[PDB]
Amino acid sequence: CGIWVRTSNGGHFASPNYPDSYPPNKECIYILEAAPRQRIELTFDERYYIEPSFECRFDHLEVRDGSPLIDRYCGMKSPALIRSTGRFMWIKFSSDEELEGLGFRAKYSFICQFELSGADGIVRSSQVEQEEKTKPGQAVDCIWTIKATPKAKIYLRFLDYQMEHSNECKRNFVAVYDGSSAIENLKAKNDVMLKTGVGVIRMWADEGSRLSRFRMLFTSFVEPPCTSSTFFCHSNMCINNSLVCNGVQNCAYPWDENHCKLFEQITKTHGTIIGVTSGIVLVLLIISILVQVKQPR
Amino acid sequence: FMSSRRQSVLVKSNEEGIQRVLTSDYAFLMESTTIEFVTQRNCNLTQIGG
Numbered sequence: 001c002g003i004w005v006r007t008s009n010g011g012h013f014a015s016p017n018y019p020d021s022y023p024p025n026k027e028c029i030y031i032l033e034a035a036p037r038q039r040i041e042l043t044f045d046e047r048y049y050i051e052p053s054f055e056c057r058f059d060h061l062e063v064r065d066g067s068p069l070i071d072r073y074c075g076m077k078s079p080a081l082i083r084s085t086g087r088f089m090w091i092k093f094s095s096d097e098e099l100e101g102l103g104f105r106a107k108y109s110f111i112c113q114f115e116l117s118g119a120d121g122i123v124r125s126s127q128v129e130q131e132e133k134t135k136p137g138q139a140v141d142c143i144w145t146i147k148a149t150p151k152a153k154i155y156l157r158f159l160d161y162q163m164e165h166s167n168e169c170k171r172n173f174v175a176v177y178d179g180s181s182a183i184e185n186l187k188a189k190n191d192v193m194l195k196t197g198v199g200v201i202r203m204w205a206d207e208g209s210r211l212s213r214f215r216m217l218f219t220s221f222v223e224p225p226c227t228s229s230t231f232f233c234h235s236n237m238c239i240n241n242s243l244v245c246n247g248v249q250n251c252a253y254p255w256d257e258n259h260c261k262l263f264e265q266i267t268k269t270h271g272t273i274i275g276v277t278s279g280i281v282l283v284l285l286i287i288s289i290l291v292q293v294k295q296p297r
Numbered sequence: 298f299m300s301s302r303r304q305s306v307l308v309k310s311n312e313e314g315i316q317r318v319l320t321s322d323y324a325f326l327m328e329s330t331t332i333e334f335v336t337q338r339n340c341n342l343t344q345i346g347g
Contacts, residue, residue: 235309253304 001028002180009110015093015103018047022103024095029180032089032108040084043107052077059099064090067183076102090182112140117147119220119241120250123201125160125213139171139206145181146199146218149241153223154194156201157252162212171206174214191252193222219243219250231256318342 005011013030015022034040052075060072063079065086073079089108112132116123123144134140148154156176165172175189177200187194199218205211221230221239230238233251243250245260266272299307306323308314314325315335319342329344336343 235313 001026002030004031005108006031006033011108013091013106013108015105018103018105020103021100022093022095024097024100026093026095028093029182029184030091030093031180032084032091034084034087034089034110036087038087039111040087040089041107041109041111042082042084042089043109044078044081045105045107046076046078047105048076048102050076054099054101058094058096059101060094061104062092062094062184064092064182064184066090069183092182092184112142114142114144116144119149119152120218120243120246120248122159122215122217125215126205126209126211128209136208139204140209141202141204143181143203144199144201146194146201148197148199148222149220151223152197152220154197154199155191155219155222155237155252156194156199156216157191157219157249158214158216160213160215163214164212165206165208165210169204172204172211174201174203176201197223217248217250 001016003013005013016026016028017023032040032042052073054075056074058074060074062072063070063082065084066088067090070082071079091106093104112128112134114131128134128140128142132142146154161174163169163172163174169189173189176187176192176194177185178187178194179185179196179200180198181200181202203211203214219239221241222237224238225236226232226238230240231244232238233255234253237251239251240256243256246257248257250257266276268275308317308325311327311331314323314327317323318325332344
């Protein structure tokens, strides 16, 4: 349902089935993403010129800059133009069960985030002196983007977590976002299960990188009930592309990377050697005695 | 003990707990009727105590 319009000076943005009425029970998120010093023009042509009809809290259209939510409109009005300086406009359209109507049209035009995706991996804690070397003095904060293998919900497990800077978080905290990276839905700020297939990890810090560590692992193929070939680590946790016994606790309980892992006579660390040497000496002595024995007739 | 272990030794169903018992020294306390059924269908694991 999402209509991404990245790296286009111009294009068009409108409700699903736009000349028709919008389909119900949608929940679609939209982005206007611009380069630094690239300014965004967002425009509403009204398809239906009137003061808004159904002014209420269902079927709203949110508008997101950066997330302080600028506003929510509804009914049948156009918001006036809003000039973009955050250059990352986030548009959410929601639809109810039983209020269906003319929909909407829009016109967009142009006037510490890292990528981390795959099947498995770890977000290095305070890994900021290499990506975007930020001096420790200022408050620092960064977000982390996860993308699963096609058709894969994600499960996360924290390996090391200690925010000693403060128990409270008005300064420092670690949070997880599900869905796409908006302020829309905090999954949480324990291990976690991502309902969607794209991960969002943001961390906030202040007055130093003294935060002990945020060191955690994301897993792929977490979603499906078992077809057969991947192992049943846990309930509908058949995941294996190659992570069978990958040497890391890659499941919630020890299963995939666990339970797969004549010299017995001489297996003495030093004992075998000393004893064997003494024994060879003795055998040779026995042979000496034997020579002297085959000697008398 | 279970609070300290906190999913170290815990189960969210029955059959997986049955298999965990089948694979390790696992107690897996259960209601008596299903224990009777299982220990009669199989013949390798039996209830202890009362």
